[PDB]
Amino acid sequence: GAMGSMERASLIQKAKLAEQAERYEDMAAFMKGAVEKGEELSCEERNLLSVAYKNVVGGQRAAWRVLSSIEQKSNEGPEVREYREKVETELQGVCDTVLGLLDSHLIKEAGDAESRVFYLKMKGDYYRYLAEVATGDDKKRIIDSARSAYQEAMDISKKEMPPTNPIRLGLALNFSVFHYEIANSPEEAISLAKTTFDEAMADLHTLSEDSYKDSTLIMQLLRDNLTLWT
Amino acid sequence: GAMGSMERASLIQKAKLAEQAERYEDMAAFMKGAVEKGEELSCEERNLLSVAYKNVVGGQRAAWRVLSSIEQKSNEGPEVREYREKVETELQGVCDTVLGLLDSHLIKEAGDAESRVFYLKMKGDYYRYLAEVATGDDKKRIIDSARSAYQEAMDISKKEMPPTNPIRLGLALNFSVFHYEIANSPEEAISLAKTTFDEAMADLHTLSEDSYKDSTLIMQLLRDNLTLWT
Amino acid sequence: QRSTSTPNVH
Amino acid sequence: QRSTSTPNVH
Ligand SMILES: *CC(=O)NCC1CCN(S(=O)(=O)c2ccc(Br)c(F)c2)CC1
Ligand SMILES: *CC(=O)NCC1CCN(S(=O)(=O)c2ccc(Br)c(F)c2)CC1
Ligand SMILES: [Cl-]
Ligand SMILES: [Cl-]
Ligand SMILES: [Mg+2]
Ligand SMILES: [Mg+2]
Ligand SMILES: [Mg+2]
Ligand SMILES: [Mg+2]
Ligand SMILES: [Mg+2]
Ligand SMILES: [Mg+2]
């Protein structure tokens, strides 16, 4: 890659500068380069990677939704479809890049429970983003891949992490979204969200000093979804 | 270019879709392609061009300012300078692209007073953006080019447009900013801004039905600068 | 309205 | 604080 000549530490440093400058594409490129050095990522580095690529794909998803809505309205000239397909192709390229990094470099048998859960959650997420724009035979493969990644992350989190852990909570939130929005399973979405919230409250004493703000934020977002869904 | 096979009208249509999707890079590319068809741009099309490229360069300027501030603070490792230079190079590339379009395609002897003023204002602006990041021999050339473009736009606007015209007002605003921020001439900035505001108020009756909101907005921005500068 | 997923922080 | 230049509209 184009980051091959740069020291790992310089790449991390530049990802942080890019974050500060809100240059999320640059940030994602710097972190891709850091990952490709083939060393494990710390918590702080996983956050950089996550933030960078979520910003990039988030912008593409929001654009895609705008174009898709215009397209659907005009089916009640080829230009709307063509531009939607262009944005879609770019979005898929970004998801494929992330899934490639996860598969080539980041997902392992060893390491932290946290790290393993986090990367499998990320795999679930970027398959879900592919599923939002998918149509045919490709789609059922994609949905199955998301569920599989999420379900494995869930099994590990439930055995190895407290119920208030932010990765555990964030994973459960995103899986419930999957169930509701992608898998068309509102009952499973609701049950997971409810169970996740109630078990965190029941073991509220497990909140960590260094992450309790994150935990409580996700608990509120679980409650917001539950209110929207019932 | 990559837009060469696409119909002009499809390019305009896609610029509008890109604007709606907040995909300003795509928007700028579509409008560059439309310009390269070599026909004049309407008012609506000039706005598309303006909005697209200002969004692109605006994001680069804001990033550059962030990095430059970090850099200056750390001069009280090469990575901050290197990344600043990278963003700077990209910004300069965008300005060169715009100035190239203006020179190759858009600025003419003929056409609307409006159109001629608007393109010379745009030339002044993108030279000013180059001047913000320039240093040496290159800089004085750049500042002279901005002043020259602005001053010619001013001469035409004063002879051919009412004092409330939004292009005339927008040009005067941006030239006053040039005087204050680039040319280090606060007295000339203030006098231009004051004169522009007072003459618009004196001939307030010239407000146009289709643009009076724009005119009054720029008048307020002139007043905001005057308050900041005195 | 869309379901809310995990946001970006820090 | 920076001087305000012409903004984007429409
Ligand atoms: C220690 C560690 O692995 N830290 C990095 C990750 C990156 C973000 N995830 S998350 O996507 O699950 C998440 C994001 C935002 C909030 Br408020 C969360 F609670 C969780 C967790 C930690
Ligand atoms: C008819 C015509 O030429 N319309 C296009 C231009 C594009 C924008 N300019 S401007 O940059 O001078 C400007 C921008 C925003 C506001 Br609120 C203005 F008043 C002027 C003017 C018209
Ligand atoms: Cl397209
Ligand atoms: Cl760099
Ligand atoms: Mg290295
Ligand atoms: Mg498709
Ligand atoms: Mg207990
Ligand atoms: Mg054509
Ligand atoms: Mg330089
Ligand atoms: Mg009069």
Side-chain angles (χ1 to χ4, degrees):
Chain A
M3 295 307 178
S5 60
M6 216 187 305
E7 287 187 341
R8 189 186 192 284
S10 300
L11 286 167
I12 299 299
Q13 179 178 357
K14 289 186 190 171
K16 291 174 189 172
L17 294 173
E19 182 178 37
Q20 295 182 84
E22 305 178 61
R23 292 273 291 187
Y24 295 106
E25 287 198 347
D26 290 349
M27 191 187 176
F30 291 134
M31 290 311 306
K32 178 176 187 298
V35 166
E36 282 168 351
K37 303 302 183 187
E39 304 179 18
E40 289 177 353
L41 296 194
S42 67
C43 282
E44 185 178 2
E45 296 166 340
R46 284 187 299 255
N47 199 61
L48 293 171
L49 181 72
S50 186
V51 169
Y53 277 111
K54 267 276 286 163
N55 268 283
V56 172
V57 80
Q60 296 169 320
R61 291 165 72 212
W64 185 96
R65 288 186 194 120
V66 163
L67 296 176
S68 186
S69 177
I70 296 174
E71 190 181 2
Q72 167 265 310
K73 283 178 194 296
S74 67
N75 295 158
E76 291 176 349
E79 296 86 357
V80 182
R81 175 182 53 70
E82 292 172 346
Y83 185 45
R84 191 267 296 143
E85 285 172 11
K86 174 186 180 168
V87 173
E88 184 171 308
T89 302
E90 282 173 37
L91 184 158
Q92 292 169 323
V94 171
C95 295
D96 289 347
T97 297
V98 171
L99 290 169
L101 286 172
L102 285 166
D103 251 56
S104 295
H105 290 282
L106 295 167
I107 291 164
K108 304 175 186 297
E109 283 281 342
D112 288 306
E114 282 202 312
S115 74
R116 284 186 296 118
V117 175
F118 169 73
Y119 296 127
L120 294 170
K121 172 188 168 295
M122 192 182 205
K123 186 172 175 177
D125 286 349
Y126 285 86
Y127 272 120
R128 166 159 66 80
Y129 304 152
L130 289 179
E132 293 178 345
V133 308
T135 52
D137 281 343
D138 200 23
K139 193 180 191 192
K140 294 181 184 177
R141 298 176 205 159
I142 289 164
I143 287 184
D144 289 344
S145 296
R147 177 178 305 114
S148 177
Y150 282 137
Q151 189 59 66
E152 192 187 348
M154 287 290 310
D155 293 345
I156 299 164
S157 72
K158 290 186 69 184
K159 289 162 188 173
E160 305 205 59
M161 304 172 120
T164 58
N165 178 280
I167 300 162
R168 179 169 168 178
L169 290 176
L171 163 64
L173 183 60
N174 287 12
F175 201 16
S176 71
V177 171
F178 172 82
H179 286 311
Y180 195 92
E181 294 290 352
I182 305 303
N184 197 20
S185 297
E187 67 294 303
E188 290 182 61
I190 288 166
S191 298
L192 180 57
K194 172 82 168 172
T195 297
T196 306
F197 182 87
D198 289 346
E199 290 182 355
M201 286 291 299
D203 281 336
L204 189 66
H205 70 273
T206 66
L207 286 170
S208 171
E209 290 179 62
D210 53 40
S211 67
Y212 72 87
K213 295 176 194 175
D214 295 348
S215 298
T216 60
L217 175 52
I218 307 301
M219 287 167 73
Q220 181 61 48
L221 298 181
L222 289 160
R223 177 50 64 196
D224 296 347
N225 282 349
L226 285 169
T227 295
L228 171 64
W229 297 347
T230 56
Chain B
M3 295 307 178
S5 60
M6 216 187 305
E7 287 187 341
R8 189 186 192 284
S10 300
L11 286 167
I12 299 299
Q13 179 178 357
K14 289 186 190 171
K16 291 174 189 172
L17 294 173
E19 182 178 37
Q20 295 182 84
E22 305 178 61
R23 292 273 291 187
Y24 295 106
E25 287 198 347
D26 290 349
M27 191 187 176
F30 291 134
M31 290 311 306
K32 178 176 187 298
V35 166
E36 282 168 351
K37 303 302 183 187
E39 304 179 18
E40 289 177 353
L41 296 194
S42 67
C43 282
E44 185 178 2
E45 296 166 340
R46 284 187 299 255
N47 199 61
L48 293 171
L49 181 72
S50 186
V51 169
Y53 277 111
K54 267 276 286 163
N55 268 283
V56 172
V57 80
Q60 296 169 320
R61 291 165 72 212
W64 185 96
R65 288 186 194 120
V66 163
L67 296 176
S68 186
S69 177
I70 296 174
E71 190 181 2
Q72 167 265 310
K73 283 178 194 296
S74 67
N75 295 158
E76 291 176 349
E79 296 86 357
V80 182
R81 175 182 53 70
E82 292 172 346
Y83 185 45
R84 191 267 296 143
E85 285 172 11
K86 174 186 180 168
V87 173
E88 184 171 308
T89 302
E90 282 173 37
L91 184 158
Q92 292 169 323
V94 171
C95 295
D96 289 347
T97 297
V98 171
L99 290 169
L101 286 172
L102 285 166
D103 251 56
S104 295
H105 290 282
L106 295 167
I107 291 164
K108 304 175 186 297
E109 283 281 342
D112 288 306
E114 282 202 312
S115 74
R116 284 186 296 118
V117 175
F118 169 73
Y119 296 127
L120 294 170
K121 172 188 168 295
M122 192 182 205
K123 186 172 175 177
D125 286 349
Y126 285 86
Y127 272 120
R128 166 159 66 80
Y129 304 152
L130 289 179
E132 293 178 345
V133 308
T135 52
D137 281 343
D138 200 23
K139 193 180 191 192
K140 294 181 184 177
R141 298 176 205 159
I142 289 164
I143 287 184
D144 289 344
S145 296
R147 177 178 305 114
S148 177
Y150 282 137
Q151 189 59 66
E152 192 187 348
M154 287 290 310
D155 293 345
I156 299 164
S157 72
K158 290 186 69 184
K159 289 162 188 173
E160 305 205 59
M161 304 172 120
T164 58
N165 178 280
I167 300 162
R168 179 169 168 178
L169 290 176
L171 163 64
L173 183 60
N174 287 12
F175 201 16
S176 71
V177 171
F178 172 82
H179 286 311
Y180 195 92
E181 294 290 352
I182 305 303
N184 197 20
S185 297
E187 67 294 303
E188 290 182 61
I190 288 166
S191 298
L192 180 57
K194 172 82 168 172
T195 297
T196 306
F197 182 87
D198 289 346
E199 290 182 355
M201 286 291 299
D203 281 336
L204 189 66
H205 70 273
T206 66
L207 286 170
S208 171
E209 290 179 62
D210 53 40
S211 67
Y212 72 87
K213 295 176 194 175
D214 295 348
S215 298
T216 60
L217 175 52
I218 307 301
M219 287 167 73
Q220 181 61 48
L221 298 181
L222 289 160
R223 177 50 64 196
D224 296 347
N225 282 349
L226 285 169
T227 295
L228 171 64
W229 297 347
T230 56
Chain C
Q1 185 181 356
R2 270 196 308 111
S3 304
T4 311
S5 63
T6 297
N8 297 290
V9 305
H10 296 108
Chain D
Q1 185 181 356
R2 270 196 308 111
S3 304
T4 311
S5 63
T6 297
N8 297 290
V9 305
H10 296 108

